[PDB]
Design a protein around this ligand. Structure first.
Ligand SMILES: [Cl-]
Ligand SMILES: [Cl-]
Ligand SMILES: [Cl-]
Ligand SMILES: [Cl-]
Ligand SMILES: [Cl-]
Ligand SMILES: [Cl-]
Ligand SMILES: [Cl-]
Ligand SMILES: [Cl-]
Ligand SMILES: [Cl-]
Ligand SMILES: [Cl-]
Ligand SMILES: [Mg+2]
Ligand SMILES: [Mg+2]
Ligand SMILES: [Mg+2]
Ligand SMILES: [Mg+2]
Ligand SMILES: [Mg+2]
Ligand SMILES: [Mg+2]
Ligand SMILES: [Mg+2]
Ligand SMILES: [Mg+2]
Ligand SMILES: [Mg+2]
Ligand SMILES: [Mg+2]
Ligand SMILES: [Mg+2]
Ligand SMILES: [N+]
Ligand SMILES: [N+]
Ligand SMILES: [N+]
Ligand code: NA
Ligand code: NA
Ligand code: NA
Ligand code: NA
Ligand code: NA
Ligand code: NA
Ligand code: NA
Ligand code: NA
Ligand code: NA
Ligand code: NA
Ligand code: NA
Ligand code: NA
Ligand code: NA
Ligand code: NA
Ligand code: NA
Ligand code: NA
Ligand code: NA
Ligand code: NA
Ligand code: NA
Ligand code: NA
Ligand code: NA
Ligand code: NA
Ligand code: NA
Ligand code: NA
Ligand code: NA
Ligand code: NA
Ligand code: NA
Ligand code: NA
Lengths: 372, 372
């Protein structure tokens, strides 16, 4: 069964809802990311798992243990859950030595003195903390304190590691390296990890799966490929990706096209069939395609006038060196493409644009849910 | 209505007791210091007030709310308590200006924009953040980001702020300035604050009151003058002061003197009376007097041979420029005085020493408790 489980979890404050009926199963041993914009409920969700905040309603389990169910009067304090919040301010005694801070979980569980000493010294050396063993955290730098909390977290082996934006205070290069190092260590340890971040690249880079949240609601749980290539709804589709996915209003036509008013594109057979079966033919839907899937027709692989091509005017060309971000317009609609450097587009000049129809998305105009 | 109240609070781990039957009432709006040496239970006490640790027994109130009483199955986790923990550098929202970061909590509580603006700008002014209102976190220093986080915490108006020697990482000079800035801000806010420190000078400098702890036990709660001038027992008397208070074994005599064996001193009338009414006349007690209250007879204001004066030999004279620390000996007992620079004391030479009898202390030799 799941390493961590939330069942219909809510957190409310009067008329405000921080987390709304969230059910999530985190697999044993996976590195799960909670990703979403500011205020989306991800931090509240991590705190409820940690026990730093109580759910308003719902059940929360760590392994086979029910750690929170307010309807049953059940609430296990954070220290009694088998979890490690790798967050220094909460985990560490500033006036106890680094050595004693790291040894604490083990002496609490009556591990022999010789064993404690070797396990503490081993994890300290691994983390470059050896020379700091006799110092107290109140004397250390912020980075050193975070490392000491990490050592205390991994010296034992809890059932779950929890982290909240642990690399936000780092230089870009060090951050890229740490994302790799943290994931390598998690894989080595094999311990279920739940990690909050607002950073899409960090999420897609480190996570085995990503739980995308928006305004307290779980939008989708999937691997980086699933959330990027198979966004569950317009929120997910528009939240991940740079430049953002383009969205256009369209009518699915009886003759198999998505009609934007200003122009039309021919759907692929299978797409049109699924839309047929579901009853969207004749209806207004939301069409989406990423900038990386739009091409200058001069160099596109397959150019089909009528079906995947449209003439647009270029409004802005941003020269990024390795590519060009091209703001395009066809009458009253606009979209952005990421074209190759060899493209000769020029502001004010028209250009034919090819859409890679295999990469489009169609969503329900009312619910926002993805058809594909 | 106390701001925070602990009633008979204990925290134990097996045979080890971190905090023992502590009752403490923190006044609404006061700056309370929890001061003690390492292992005294000061951090555990702050952790139980924050809710990071559940007490083994006792009740804890934040305002009029009972937040922990294990016998009643009551335990409110940290995020659900009306407290603000001040630590490292908290959850600064990226892609959000300073103004919006501080305003965020009020944006949830749906506070009118007029009020949000006034409150945010007011808070930024107290923190010196006004010129940074339109800046993003990335454009800020670490100290600027830290102040922005404090501002976010302050605008929410918690019942109490909790911190554990947050100034510990600072160079001496900056620390002196920050103690003053922190206390000034606390007075401007009028918010109950509980601050843990191991530093005696920091405690006496910043606290309205100081809760002195030793080995899990609350020794005394008083203003800096009270803990310094009216120490409740020998621990408090010997823990604050430099050089430390001198202690000598004595016997209260029938004729109104304290007899040290090697010499005697005459008690002030009111002092002998209290010792009498309490039944100490004829008993061995612990006598105490600070170095600053010992004087070279050459410059003393009042010299009464036999009563407040004794001839001693000088063993060590430390020349501190602004004063001299003089280690004195009378037969088999020693004590240290802080004499004026003009004193002509010399190692190996005798000198008459005057004791300021109005400043002495007498403690019960068995319990260590101060009679006065
Ligand atoms: Cl702590
Ligand atoms: Cl070692
Ligand atoms: Cl990366
Ligand atoms: Cl919502
Ligand atoms: Cl919500
Ligand atoms: Cl996406
Ligand atoms: Cl062609
Ligand atoms: Cl202003
Ligand atoms: Cl004292
Ligand atoms: Cl002389
Ligand atoms: Mg967070
Ligand atoms: Mg998946
Ligand atoms: Mg892949
Ligand atoms: Mg493509
Ligand atoms: Mg794509
Ligand atoms: Mg140009
Ligand atoms: Mg009770
Ligand atoms: Mg809460
Ligand atoms: Mg004084
Ligand atoms: Mg004095
Ligand atoms: Mg002088
Ligand atoms: N993993
Ligand atoms: N242009
Ligand atoms: N105060
Ligand atoms: Na997985
Ligand atoms: Na939000
Ligand atoms: Na609650
Ligand atoms: Na416990
Ligand atoms: Na690593
Ligand atoms: Na895919
Ligand atoms: Na991917
Ligand atoms: Na891929
Ligand atoms: Na894609
Ligand atoms: Na792709
Ligand atoms: Na134009
Ligand atoms: Na341009
Ligand atoms: Na393709
Ligand atoms: Na006070
Ligand atoms: Na505990
Ligand atoms: Na100004
Ligand atoms: Na509040
Ligand atoms: Na200030
Ligand atoms: Na007092
Ligand atoms: Na006094
Ligand atoms: Na006073
Ligand atoms: Na004074
Ligand atoms: Na005094
Ligand atoms: Na004094
Ligand atoms: Na003299
Ligand atoms: Na000397
Ligand atoms: Na000398
Ligand atoms: Na000498």
């Amino acid at each position: 069964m799941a390493g961590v489980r939330l069942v219909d979890v809510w957190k409310v404050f009067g008329e405000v809802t921080a987390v709304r009926e969230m059910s999530l199963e985190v697999k044993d041993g996976e590195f799960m990311i909670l990703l979403g914009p500011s205020g989306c409920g991800k931090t509240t969700t991590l705190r409820m798992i940690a026990g730093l905040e109580e759910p308003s309603r719902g059940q929360i389990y760590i392994g086979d243990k029910l750690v929170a169910d307010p309807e049953k009067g059940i609430f296990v304090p954070p220290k009694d859950r088998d979890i490690a919040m790798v967050f220094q301010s909460y985990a560490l005694y500033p006036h106890m030595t680094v050595y004693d801070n790291i040894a604490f979980p083990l002496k609490l569980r009556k591990v022999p003195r010789q064993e404690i000493d070797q396990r503490v010294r081993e994890v300290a050396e691994l983390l470059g903390l050896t020379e700091l063993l006799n110092r107290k955290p109140r004397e250390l730098s912020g980075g050193q304190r975070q490392r000491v909390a990490l050592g205390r977290a991994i010296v034992r082996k809890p059932q779950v590691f929890l982290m909240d934006e642990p690399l936000s205070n780092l230089d870009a290069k060090l951050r890229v390296r740490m994302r790799a190092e943290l994931k390598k260590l998690q894989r080595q340890l094999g311990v279920t990890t739940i990690y909050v971040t607002h950073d899409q690249v960090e999420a897609m880079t480190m996570g085995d799966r990503i739980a995308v949240m928006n305004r307290g609601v779980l939008q989708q749980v999937g691997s980086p490929d699933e959330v990027y290539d198979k966004p569950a709804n317009t929120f997910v589709a528009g939240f991940i990706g740079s430049p953002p996915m383009n969205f256009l209003d369209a009518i699915v036509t009886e003759d198999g096209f998505v009609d934007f008013g200003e122009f039309r594109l021919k759907l692929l057979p299978d797409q049109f069939e699924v839309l047929g079966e579901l009853g969207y033919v004749g209806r207004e839907v939301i069409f989406g395609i990423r900038p990386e899937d739009l091409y200058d027709a001069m160099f596109a692989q397959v150019r089909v006038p009528g079906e995947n091509l449209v003439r647009a005017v270029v409004e802005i060309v941003e020269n990024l060196g390795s590519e060009r971000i091209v703001r395009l317009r066809v009458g009253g609609v606009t979209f952005v493409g990421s074209f190759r450097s060899e493209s000769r587009v020029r502001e004010g000049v028209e250009v034919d644009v090819v859409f890679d129809m295999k990469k489009i998305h169609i969503f329900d105009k009312t619910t926002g849910k993805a058809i594909f």
